[PDB]
């Protein structure tokens, strides 16, 4: 079986859906401590925003998400019809028929990544000041990838630091964080390597997109062996978007050029699972240095 | 609207009524409220934390679909072949509608934090004497757009849940109807208790004639006990009730009541919320 499976009893209860779990108090306390630790490394002048698990469908469309991962997107739908119509749908359900045929899309999707909503927000403020803007964002995200592996969820929490400004601003930020992220994983007693990577772009063209992204080194990941050293798990990523979002949303840097952006993302559930996989379910037995930095 | 002005310090627009980004000020208060509620948690209470989505089939069995079908948010996705999905996005490129290729997932956005806990308890067999107590939280969803700050589409719910005999649930209800009030009192909130059976603690937010329900008690009879086959220690279908706290409503209440400057909040309140 999967090396992570034995962890399930202590960390999760089933909710009748693969990748969707109830968190025990033990698991939760570790997520919160990881969150606090990440917060303690926040750079000065970084604005903290917290987003709900949903976001505007129009914004997600405009962001170009359907062009990259249409297969992962969770859209919100409801019964928007007339009372007669809605009653009809319910009656089918009562009669073992299919109520869902009356669903129609809402103006909302479940967020695929924590940073998305922040770009329209930064743009509404007009031109960027010299040195750009830094944001601290989090959200419960959704990706439509059902799986029984504990490191592959459908609903998971994502925490990010986001840099918006000049190519220089973003590169400095990304470099800084690739170093600081490795220092953090060390403090946590986790084994890792950092490597160039690519997003799981969809379809045939998606294979050309990934090769290109990898060669341009626009995405690094911090990888931790969970089920094996041969196929480690990405628990953080460092993403350079170049000018995509700046152009998309009309954000201009202090030079009046289309702003560049990048983000450093922490997979909270993946990090928590890595911690338990590495140090086990008995917190009293965790290494003293680890217990100390987490303030246990 | 009395609350509208609060937005300046609490929220940023996300392109959708009732869906706002939350500032550090606002979130710090939501967290402290969460902490305060935790401090009143009863012994022997199992704390579970639910994600924003849950089983569609569980939701169907809960009866929610019969009661508030218009408020449900169902999860839908593109579940077809690669060619079908590409076409959908191409239609979108050509000024058409890509959503016609959507089909329901096995999931919905949770309408109430406690719903998923009932099948969990049922799965463990007969309840012990005295029943079970749970502490649940979830980001919940209600498909009802509004510009009012106390009527969101996505909001945090916190709940203590009692599963047991009618005696268990009644003692639990009585206890919590009292604690809920004591809590609102310590928060320096002005409220009245009404019986909409269901108990509700309503706080004047827009007006005194139309106060907002910020905490409630729901008694479900043996509805979930019967649906999931939860059996009490005497072999009968279990009863359930829950005390529910609208975390985002409570936070808006606090800012409305005491203002957006935490330094000028009363010392009692700063004290109980670990601010002073
Ligand atoms: C007036 C009519 C449209 C509905 O009235 P209402 O605003 O729902 O008033 P209610 O008495 O139903 O409020 C209670 C419900 O509001 C919901 N709620 C809580 N916080 C909310 C918020 N921030 N935004 C929208 N709804 C919220 C909860 O689901 C709650 O249900 P519960 O008390 O059984 O747990
Ligand atoms: N299915 C899943 N289950 C659990 N965690 C996941 C996940 N998908 C992503 N994550 C976590 O979120 C992080 C960010 O994912 P990503 O790099 O694919 O998205 C982004 O581009 C963030 N802007 C990953 O490094 C991982 O730690
Ligand atoms: Zn990001
Ligand atoms: Zn409930």
Instruction: Tell me the CB-side half-sphere exposure of residue B245, using CA atoms within 13 A.
Output: 28
Q: How far apart are the first and last CA of chain B?
A: 31
**CA–CA distance, A80 with B68 (Å, rounded to integer):** 12
DSSP type of residue A256: S
B contacts of A89 (beta carbons < 8 Å)? 69
Helical (H) or strand (E) element with A17: strand A12-17
Helical (H) or strand (E) element with A58: helix A57-62
Instruction: Give yes or no for residue B158 CB within 6 A of ligand 1.
Output: no
Instruction: Give yes or no for residue A198 CB within 6 A of ligand 2.
Output: no
Decide: B140 and B155 in contact? Cβ < 8 Å.
yes
Q: Which amino acid residue places its CA nearest to atom 15 of ligand 1?
A: B213
Decide: A225 and A232 in contact? Cβ < 8 Å.
yes
Please state the atom number of ligand 1 nearest to the C-alpha of residue B159.
Answer: 35
**CA–CA distance, B42 with B132 (Å, rounded to integer):** 11
**Has B242 been labeled as part of a binding site?**
yes
**Has B215 been labeled as part of a binding site?**
yes
For residue A205, the SS3 value is helix
Q: What is the number of domains present in chain B?
A: 1
- What are B232's two structure tokens? 């009490």
**Has B214 been labeled as part of a binding site?**
yes
With tokens 């509805």, the residue in question is B223
Print the SS3 string covering chain B: CCCHHHHHHHEEEEEECCEEEEEHHHHHHHHHHHHHHHHCCCCCEEEEECCCEEEHHHHHHHCHHHHCHHHCEEEEECCCCHHHHHHHHHHHHCCCCHHHHCEEEEEEECCCCCCCHHHHHHCCCCCCCCCEEEEEEEEEECCCCCCCCCCCCEEEEEEEEEEECHHHHHHHHHHHHHHHHHHHHHCCCCCEEECCCCEEEEECCCCCCCCEEEEEEEECCCHHHHHHCCECCCCCECEEEEEEEEHHHHHHHHHHHHCCCHHHCCHHHHHHCCCC
B contacts of A141 (beta carbons < 8 Å)? none
Q: Nearest CA to CA, how far is A23 from chain B (Å)?
A: 5
Instruction: Give yes or no for residue B142 CB within 6 A of ligand 1.
Output: yes
**Pairing relationship of beta strands B212-219 and B199-203 according to DSSP bridges:** antiparallel
Breaks (C-N over 2.5 A) in chain B follow: 196
Query: From the centroid of its chain, how far is CA B118?
Result: 16
Decide: A296 and A144 in contact? Cβ < 8 Å.
no
- Rounded to 10 degrees, the C-alpha dihedral A178/A184/A189/A190 comes to -40
For residue A156, the SS3 value is strand
Decide: A261 and A163 in contact? Cβ < 8 Å.
yes
Please give the order of strands across the beta sheet that includes B11-16: A193-196, A219-224, A233-242, A260-267, A155-165, A133-142, A46-50, B19-23, B11-16
Say which experimental method was used. Answer: X-ray
| Residue B143: how many other CB atoms lie within 10 Å | 22
Q: Which residues surround ligand 4, an ion (CB under 5 A)?
A: B 112, 114, 159, 242
Instruction: Give yes or no for residue A265 CB within 6 A of ligand 2.
Output: yes
A contacts of B76 (beta carbons < 8 Å)? 74-77, 103, 105
Print the SS3 string covering B89-125: HHHHHCCCCHHHHCEEEEEEECCCCCCCHHHHHHCCC
Helical (H) or strand (E) element with A194: strand A193-196
For B16, the closest of A78, A79, A107 (CB atoms) is: A107
Print the SS3 string covering A62-115: HCCHHHCCHHHCCEEEECCCCHHHHHHHHHHHHCCCCHHHHCEEEEEEECCCCC
Q: Do A20 and B107 make contact, defined as CB atoms within 8 angstroms? A: yes
With tokens 């990010």, the residue in question is A160
Q: Can you state the angle between helices B82-93 and A203-215, rounded to 10 degrees? A: 80
The ligand with the least distance to the CA atom of B62 is 4
For A22, the closest of B103, B107, B120 (CB atoms) is: B120
B contacts of A124 (beta carbons < 8 Å)? 13
Nearest Cα to A141, choosing from A152, A127, A156?
A: A156
- What are B263's two structure tokens? 């330094």
Resolution in A for the shown PDB structure?
A: 2.2
CATH code at position B33: 3.30.930.10
For B52, the closest of A28, A59, A140 (CB atoms) is: A140
Instruction: Give yes or no for residue B248 CB within 6 A of ligand 1.
Output: yes
Residue to mutate among B21, B66, B85, B134, with most A CBs inside 10 A, is: B21
For A20, the closest of B51, B82, B92 (CB atoms) is: B51
Residues 6+ apart with CB under 8 A from A40: none
Please give the order of strands across the beta sheet that includes B53-55: A54-56, A104-110, A75-78, B73-77, B103-109, B53-55
**CA–CA distance, B240 with B118 (Å, rounded to integer):** 9
Q: Give the range of the structural domain holding residue A142, as residue numbers without chain letter.
A: 1-296
Q: What is the CA angle B61-B63-B69, rounded to 5? A: 120
Instruction: Tell me the CB-side half-sphere exposure of residue A296, using CA atoms within 13 A.
Output: 19
Residues 6+ apart with CB under 8 A from A186: none
């Amino acid at each position: 079986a999967d090396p992570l499976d034995h962890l399930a009893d202590k960390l999760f209860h089933s909710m009748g859906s693969d990748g969707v779990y109830a968190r025990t108090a033990l698991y939760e306390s570790i997520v919160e401590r990881l969150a606090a630790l990440i917060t303690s490394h926040r750079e000065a002048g970084t604005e903290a925003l917290r987003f709900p698990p949903v976001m505007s469908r129009a914004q997600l469309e405009k962001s170009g998400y359907l062009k990259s991962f249409p297969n992962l997107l969770g859209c919100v739908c409801g019964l928007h019809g007339t009372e007669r119509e809605i009653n009809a749908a319910v009656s089918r359900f009562d009669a073992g028929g299919d109520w869902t045929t009356s669903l129609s899309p809402a103006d909302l999707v479940l967020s695929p990544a924590a940073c998305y909503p922040v770009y329209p927000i930064a743009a509404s403020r007009g031109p960027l000041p010299k040195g750009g803007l830094r944001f601290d964002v989090a959200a419960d995200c959704f990706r439509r990838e059902p799986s029984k592996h504990l490191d592959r969820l459908q609903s998971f929490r994502m925490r990010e630091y986001v840099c918006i400004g000049t190519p220089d601003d973003v590169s400095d930020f990304r470099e800084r964080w690739m170093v600081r992220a490795q220092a953090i994983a060390r403090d946590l007693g986790l084994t890792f390597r950092v490597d160039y990577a690519s997003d799981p772009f969809f379809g045939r063209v998606g294979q050309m997109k990934a090769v290109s992204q990898k060669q341009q080194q626009l995405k690094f990941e911090l990888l931790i062996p969970l089920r094996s050293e041969e196929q480690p798990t990405a628990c953080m990523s460092f993403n350079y978007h170049r000018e995509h979002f700046g152009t998309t949303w009309g954000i201009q840097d202090a030079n009046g050029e289309p702003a560049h952006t990048g983000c450093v993302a922490f997979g909270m559930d993946r990090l928590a699972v890595a911690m338990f996989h590495t140090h086990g379910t008995d917190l009293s037995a965790w290494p003293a240095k680890v217990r100390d930095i987490l303030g246990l």
